[PDB]
Amino acid sequence: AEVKGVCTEAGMYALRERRVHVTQEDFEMAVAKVMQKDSEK
Amino acid sequence: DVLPPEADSSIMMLTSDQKPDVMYADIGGMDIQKQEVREAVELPLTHFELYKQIGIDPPRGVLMYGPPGCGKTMLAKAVAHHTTAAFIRVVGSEFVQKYLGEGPRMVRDVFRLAKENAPAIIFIDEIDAIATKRFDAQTGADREVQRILLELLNQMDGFDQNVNVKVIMATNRADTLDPALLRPGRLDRKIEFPLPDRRQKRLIFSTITSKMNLSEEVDLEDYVARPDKISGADINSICQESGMLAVRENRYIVLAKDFEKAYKTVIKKDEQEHEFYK
Amino acid sequence: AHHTDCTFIRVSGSELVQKFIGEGARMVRELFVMAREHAPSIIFMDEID
Amino acid sequence: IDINDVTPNCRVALRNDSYTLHKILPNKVDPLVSLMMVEKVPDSTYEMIGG
Amino acid sequence: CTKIINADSEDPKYIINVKQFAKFVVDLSDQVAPTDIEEGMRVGVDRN
Amino acid sequence: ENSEKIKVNKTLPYLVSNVIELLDVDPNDQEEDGANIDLDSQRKGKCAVIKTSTRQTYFLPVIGLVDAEKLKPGDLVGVNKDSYLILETLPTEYDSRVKAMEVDERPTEQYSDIGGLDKQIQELVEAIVLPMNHKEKFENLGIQPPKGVLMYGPPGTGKTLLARACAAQTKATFLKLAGPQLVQMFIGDGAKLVRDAFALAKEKAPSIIFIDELDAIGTKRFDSEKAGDREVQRTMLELLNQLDGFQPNTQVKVIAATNRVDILDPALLRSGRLDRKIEFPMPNEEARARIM
Amino acid sequence: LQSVGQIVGEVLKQLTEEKFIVKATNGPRYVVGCRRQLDKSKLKPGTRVALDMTTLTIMRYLPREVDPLVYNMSHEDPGNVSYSEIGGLSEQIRELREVIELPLTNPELFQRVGIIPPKGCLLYGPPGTGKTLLARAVASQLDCNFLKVVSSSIVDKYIGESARLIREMFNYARDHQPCIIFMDEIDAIGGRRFSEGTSADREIQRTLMELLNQMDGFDTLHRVKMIMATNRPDTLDPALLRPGRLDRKIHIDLPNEQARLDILKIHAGPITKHGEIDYEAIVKLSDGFNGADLRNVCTEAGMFAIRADHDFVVQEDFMKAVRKVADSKKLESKLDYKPV
Amino acid sequence: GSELVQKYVGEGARMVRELFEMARTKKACLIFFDEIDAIGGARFDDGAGGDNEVQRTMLELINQLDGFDPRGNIKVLMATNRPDTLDPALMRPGRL
Numbered sequence A: 001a002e003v004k005g006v007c008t009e010a011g012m013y014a015l016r017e018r019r020v021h022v023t024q025e026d027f028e029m030a031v032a033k034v035m036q037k038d039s040e041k
Numbered sequence B: 001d002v003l004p005p006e007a008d009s010s011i012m013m014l015t016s017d018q019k020p021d022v023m024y025a026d027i028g029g030m031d032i033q034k035q036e037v038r039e040a041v042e043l044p045l046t047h048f049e050l051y052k053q054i055g056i057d058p059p060r061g062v063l064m065y066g067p068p069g070c071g072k073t074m075l076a077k078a079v080a081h082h083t084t085a086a087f088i089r090v091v092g093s094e095f096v097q098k099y100l101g102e103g104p105r106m107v108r109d110v111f112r113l114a115k116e117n118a119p120a121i122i123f124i125d126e127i128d129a130i131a132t133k134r135f136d137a138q139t140g141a142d143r144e145v146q147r148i149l150l151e152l153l154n155q156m157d158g159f160d161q162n163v164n165v166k167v168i169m170a171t172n173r174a175d176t177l178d179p180a181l182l183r184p185g186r187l188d189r190k191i192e193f194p195l196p197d198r199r200q201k202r203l204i205f206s207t208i209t210s211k212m213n214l215s216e217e218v219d220l221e222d223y224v225a226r227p228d229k230i231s232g233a234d235i236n237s238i239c240q241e242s243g244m245l246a247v248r249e250n251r252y253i254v255l256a257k258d259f260e261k262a263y264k265t266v267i268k269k270d271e272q273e274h275e276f277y278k
Numbered sequence C: 001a002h003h004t005d006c007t008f009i010r011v012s013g014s015e016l017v018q019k020f021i022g023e024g025a026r027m028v029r030e031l032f033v034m035a036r037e038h039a040p041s042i043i044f045m046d047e048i049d
Numbered sequence D: 001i002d003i004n005d006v007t008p009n010c011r012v013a014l015r016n017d018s019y020t021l022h023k024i025l026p027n028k029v030d031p032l033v034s035l036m037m038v039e040k041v042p043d044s045t046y047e048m049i050g051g
Numbered sequence E: 001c002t003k004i005i006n007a008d009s010e011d012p013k014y015i016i017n018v019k020q021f022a023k024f025v026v027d028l029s030d031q032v033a034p035t036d037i038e039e040g041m042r043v044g045v046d047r048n
Numbered sequence F: 001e002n003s004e005k006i007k008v009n010k011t012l013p014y015l016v017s018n019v020i021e022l023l024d025v026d027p028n029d030q031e032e033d034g035a036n037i038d039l040d041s042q043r044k045g046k047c048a049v050i051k052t053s054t055r056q057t058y059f060l061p062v063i064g065l066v067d068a069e070k071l072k073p074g075d076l077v078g079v080n081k082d083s084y085l086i087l088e089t090l091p092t093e094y095d096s097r098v099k100a101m102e103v104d105e106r107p108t109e110q111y112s113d114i115g116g117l118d119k120q121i122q123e124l125v126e127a128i129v130l131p132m133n134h135k136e137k138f139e140n141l142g143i144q145p146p147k148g149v150l151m152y153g154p155p156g157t158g159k160t161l162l163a164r165a166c167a168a169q170t171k172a173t174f175l176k177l178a179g180p181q182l183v184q185m186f187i188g189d190g191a192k193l194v195r196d197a198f199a200l201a202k203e204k205a206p207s208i209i210f211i212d213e214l215d216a217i218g219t220k221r222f223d224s225e226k227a228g229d230r231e232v233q234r235t236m237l238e239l240l241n242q243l244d245g246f247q248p249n250t251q252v253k254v255i256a257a258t259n260r261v262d263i264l265d266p267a268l269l270r271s272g273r274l275d276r277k278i279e280f281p282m283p284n285e286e287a288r289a290r291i292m
Numbered sequence G: 001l002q003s004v005g006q007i008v009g010e011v012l013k014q015l016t017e018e019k020f021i022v023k024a025t026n027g028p029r030y031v032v033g034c035r036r037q038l039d040k041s042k043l044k045p046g047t048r049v050a051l052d053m054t055t056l057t058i059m060r061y062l063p064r065e066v067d068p069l070v071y072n073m074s075h076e077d078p079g080n081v082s083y084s085e086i087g088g089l090s091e092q093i094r095e096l097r098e099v100i101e102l103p104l105t106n107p108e109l110f111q112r113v114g115i116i117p118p119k120g121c122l123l124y125g126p127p128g129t130g131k132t133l134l135a136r137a138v139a140s141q142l143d144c145n146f147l148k149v150v151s152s153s154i155v156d157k158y159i160g161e162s163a164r165l166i167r168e169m170f171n172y173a174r175d176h177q178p179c180i181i182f183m184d185e186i187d188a189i190g191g192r193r194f195s196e197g198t199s200a201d202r203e204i205q206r207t208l209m210e211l212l213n214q215m216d217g218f219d220t221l222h223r224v225k226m227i228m229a230t231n232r233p234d235t236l237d238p239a240l241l242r243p244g245r246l247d248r249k250i251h252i253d254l255p256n257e258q259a260r261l262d263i264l265k266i267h268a269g270p271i272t273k274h275g276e277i278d279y280e281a282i283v284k285l286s287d288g289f290n291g292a293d294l295r296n297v298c299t300e301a302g303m304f305a306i307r308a309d310h311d312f313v314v315q316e317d318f319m320k321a322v323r324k325v326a327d328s329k330k331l332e333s334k335l336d337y338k339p340v
Numbered sequence H: 001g002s003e004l005v006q007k008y009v010g011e012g013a014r015m016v017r018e019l020f021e022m023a024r025t026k027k028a029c030l031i032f033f034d035e036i037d038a039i040g041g042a043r044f045d046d047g048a049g050g051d052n053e054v055q056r057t058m059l060e061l062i063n064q065l066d067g068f069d070p071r072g073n074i075k076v077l078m079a080t081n082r083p084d085t086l087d088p089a090l091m092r093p094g095r096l
């Protein structure tokens, strides 16, 4: 279930930077953010 | 004959003597929630083309919740002040009416006016009154509440992703809510409002105390470093109480002893630390 | 349920949909009286906590 | 009017004083549409499975 | 059919409560004696 | 002829209805002739707004056959069916249940027909009869009479017998009531009976009201987080306040009785509400001769 | 006799120079034309108006109503006890009047320091100490309108009457600007939101959350103050005790010995006594009495003299009464309770 | 006895009132109560309310037989299996 989450969230990161495609570092930042939010409860 | 569109309820938030006027500066430390509500509501007004191109499925409904005393309603005030499009606010428990059928009408016309007027925003505060889990289908009052909930859901679901109508809905206890409301496609965003921890407490103190003369030698770091997980609506009461304490004795500059006695007055936690267990 | 073409219905014992099933639902199995009109069906439930 | 055309659960116009039938109306109501629309189950198929 | 609320003195005048209409001030008709209309019981009243 | 012309209008099938408001009216700034109204300008006294039973609301430009001085909001008036002119003021109304809880054929006894209680009988009569027949005896001393009494004790004793005798010997207006009779199904139907009972009993000069079996109502409040019977507590919190709060009264005397006392809420046992608490023994070896 | 009533209703909007939409209070909407002279400048959307019944034309506009309930709770009060009659807690009186009067007058002080005065406070303490007496003492002395409700009469069996009444009384307070709402026995309605409940209940939860919304929601009061008094503050909803809504909580306790002297001197005043009384012993015994008990002492000491036909009190009867009441209070609960 | 447990609050008491009233309408006759121990045992309130409603029903039944001009020409008749749980105020003579 978290893989769908990381795919959903990786788009918002490109949205913030006003881009048109999704780079790999966006994926990894989304990965770390999901790990971190899961680390709490 | 036909009529030009006419309705009732909350009219318009007439925008002259109605903006409650709270700048974004009076809200401190809540940058996360600020930025994400901004991109949830105001950005889709303009950057819709990006959504279509990337394919991220623009969100429609947003629900925010948390423990009492964390400024959920202050964001609604801030947005209503700074918005450019139409704004509408209603109280969750006004839809119920004695005369049969007035509730459903009052909902459908609110939605109709919001639709035909402009790219508006509806705001419903404290919705625990209507949407709840259980029911009893013999008392009648539950019958009216059922009809209201059903057709509200129906008509929120009837929009076409073109008329740019958004909904902001807030609540106090998120436990007793029917999940059928938060089904995907209706209220797609959930926002949690926690309590300040360390970073926000200092910012709240620094912003609040800018209005008082507050002497010159008072120290604030002595109070932020303490541990007591107070809410965000207690910082305000702390500063207010110290100010009144100074007024009592006819001195118009607040001193440190004021802060001390005020802090002790507000908190009131005895020990609750029964020791021989440790 | 989609590949075998059965009317996939789920039940959670809530109260909004209860009125559609019956007036009060004193007993439970009344859904059978509604399921037989659409016989090829699958009942699905879930447990959390 | 013939009785057979007079189906159950149908909307019909009706004259004022004699209350006699006069015409027919298309719209009808059903339960299942309302229950299923409340539920909102996600139809899918085999394509999305992984592992 | 209605329910009576009370009476008042020296000249019969009565209060009538019906189920969904108003409360009325009424009197009796000639064919019925005034003794047996003890307070608080169902009565039948005409429609005009 | 004029009085008969008035009389022949007053056909008795009036409606009945409630006054909502009384208004002070002033003529307009400007006037006309050929087309002026007697009622828009050219009125200067009082006007009224009434609510009919059939849920209409009418403004009245001319009050009618009753002097405006004696009306106040909430009054109950009988009104002509067609014009909705006001025609009469009715006696105020009391719920059909309450008018039932009044004695009207007296119980018949004597204080002689109780054995073995010579102190409690005195303790009651001294606190209920004298403040009703010998006011001056308390006035001269500069004191306030005791305010309502509780009687309690094990079941097979004289608790209710005494109240019966008391009603048989006094001459005040006497109301008999029972605890569970104040519980009702629809929310807020109870308190309306509590306050109607007290309201009726203070429209008579000396009155006593006897709350039997109070432990149906006075049960201790508790903190509960899942579910509870908040309803009857919310009617008790009416009784407490009718008995001693804002706008103190003085013309109603309260008696209450029970056979359990560890249950009742402390806020109902306070010194101001239940004033003298007197208690009955199991009869001693001598009385048991007298009873037989 | 030759007169007729007129229908009451409410205006929604002016359509053209001669077309208005009105809603009667009872039901059907209508389209209706005006009368020529009425100063059409004044028919703002929302004003109450009176219609002629034969043909439905505007005929007169009116001021806002007051529902008889609010009128009645506007002004019924014995209203005459002085601060002289309250002894033993002057400090609490200072603490309270520093919120409900000093910022109605004198507003220029606070704006000098930079704060906003509190909105409301609550009183709490064990039964029989005087939480109500203090409020009557306030209502006697100071001159601003004063609504006075018992928080249990405002409930009615139809569907949405309660929330309607609460909105109406806060409107009536907004019209007349210096006002004080007093809300007695609040624990009847404050309760707590049940996790399960029952149908006959949830009306009360609607009403409560409605009151909260008017006390602080997306709106702002000015010059309205409220004070609330309760017997036991443990079972209060955690939202209603938020510092935004009720700012200060004032504790009223059992009297200190010095306070017992102070209180007893009063109700001993008018009694025809004899000049040999030593209050200090009566103080010495009265451990743990509430204020309401000392009135009772002063009553029994007279009762023991109504028999034996002494028209004067003497010091022995005070001893008798004190011991007689001392042993009757062995069946109360003596739990203090605390808001948290 | 099990016929005297009802859905809503204050219903059982009403039923007992009109039961005795309908009995009073006639000249005189018998009432048979069966399986009493389901309707009232004793009063033991503690913590959260327990059996409070049934207790109010029992109190109304008790009150109908005693205090202020009793029923007169009516005889009752009861039965049970475990009578140790009956309430003292119900077993007092003048009633049983």
Ligand SMILES: Nc1ncnc2c1ncn2[C@@H]1O[C@H](COP(=O)(O)OP(=O)(O)OP(=O)(O)O)[C@@H](O)[C@H]1O
Pocket: B026, B027, B028, B029, B030, B067, B068, B069, B070, B071, B072, B073, B074, B171, B172, B204, B232, B233, B236, G216, G239, G242, G244
């Ligand atoms: N940055 C901030 N974060 C939290 N609270 C703040 C902040 N700045 C000010 N406050 C104070 O917090 C309070 C928030 O008021 P508000 O009524 O909006 O709270 P709420 O959490 O929405 O509560 P409720 O659901 O009970 O209405 C105000 O009294 C305000 O002074």
Ligand SMILES: Nc1ncnc2c1ncn2[C@@H]1O[C@H](COP(=O)(O)OP(=O)(O)OP(=O)(O)O)[C@@H](O)[C@H]1O
Pocket: F244, F245, F267, F270, F272, G085, G086, G087, G088, G089, G126, G127, G128, G129, G130, G131, G132, G133, G134, G231, G263, G266, G291, G292, G295
């Ligand atoms: N300090 C005091 N001085 C004089 N009389 C007092 C004092 N405190 C209490 N009393 C007495 O209290 C009696 C009534 O108290 P009050 O009506 O205020 O109730 P309360 O203490 O608020 O309790 P409750 O309403 O919860 O039963 C009065 O008769 C008054 O004599």
Ligand SMILES: Nc1ncnc2c1ncn2[C@@H]1O[C@H](COP(=O)(O)OP(=O)(O)O)[C@@H](O)[C@H]1O
Pocket: F113, F114, F115, F116, F155, F156, F157, F158, F159, F160, F161, F291, H066, H067, H094
């Ligand atoms: N001298 C007496 N003292 C006490 N009880 C008596 C005496 N004489 C008769 N009785 C009987 O006591 C009963 C009174 O009922 P009572 O016990 O007062 O009701 P409750 O149980 O509610 O107190 C009556 O049957 C009465 O006949």
Ligand SMILES: [Mg+2]
Pocket: B072, B073, G216, G217
């Ligand atoms: Mg809020």
Ligand SMILES: [Mg+2]
Pocket: F159, F160, F212, F213, F257, H067
């Ligand atoms: Mg008895």
Ligand SMILES: [Mg+2]
Pocket: F245, G131, G132
């Ligand atoms: Mg009080």
